[PDB]
């Protein structure tokens, strides 16, 4: 049921981050168990869930292509990209960003963040 | 004086666009005289100036790096990228986007759009 959202908070939300350097990334990847094997690129949104959820309604997001929503507002964000062996030690590099994000909502909740916009 | 902004409206604002295809681009590049030589990549923001100007205050934009402002809100937008000869016929390709934009304001006005975010 409503858990893919839970999985989504766990992979793509860190409410209040303490600085956003590479040493940051390496930490939170591990904590959030994205290290076996090493996830090649992952992004975390910051701030509150309030906003993130509202991408799922015309409140803070209009539709976007086929099965995907985009937000009206911009999010502080941090993208961790692995450097090097898909296996730990898995120690990525960090890119702080600020811009709107794209997700799929189901039963009105974010349940997929779309990483394509963060290679760019 | 306050004209670099004028130049900036002329290069990077089209209030209400009639569709955003490649044939669009090719038209508005020419109209707005960006064809001799052909500008390699140019982006136009849509909607009202109201918003765009407000990137220059803590109303709709916080600072961004060194001498550059980013917007809090997202803009409908259209990026024309030249294909092929820097000389006309200059007929580019179009990419419609929606996301926040980065500019430099002077005397509180946008006077530079930053194109780097649109290669990506
Ligand atoms: Cl950014
Ligand atoms: Cl986009």
From Swiss-Prot, chains A, B:
Changing residue 27 to N: In ALS9; loss of angiogenic activity; reduced ribonucleolytic activity; unable to translocate to the nucleus. GO terms for cellular component: actin cytoskeleton; angiogenin-PRI complex; basement membrane; chromosome; cytoplasm; cytoplasmic stress granule; cytosol; endocytic vesicle. Transmembrane segments: none annotated. One of its GO terms (molecular function) is DNA binding. Its main location: secreted. Homodimer. Interacts with RNH1; inhibiting ANG ribonuclease activity. Interacts with PCNA. This is Angiogenin. It comes from Homo sapiens (Human). The gene is ANG.
């Amino acid at each position: 049921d409503n858990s893919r959202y839970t999985h989504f908070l766990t992979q793509h939300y860190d409410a209040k981050p303490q600085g956003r350097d590479d040493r940051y990334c390496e930490s939170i990847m591990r904590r959030r168990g994205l290290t076996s094997p090493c996830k090649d690129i992952n992004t975390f949104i910051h701030g509150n869930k309030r906003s993130i959820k509202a991408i799922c309604e015309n409140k803070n997001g209009n539709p976007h292509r086929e099965n995907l929503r985009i937000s009206k507002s911009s999010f502080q964000v941090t993208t961790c990209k692995l450097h090097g062996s898909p296996w730990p030690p898995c120690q990525y590099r960090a890119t702080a960003g600020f811009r709107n994000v794209v997700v799929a909502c189901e039963n009105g909740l974010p349940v997929h963040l779309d990483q394509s916009i963060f290679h760019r």
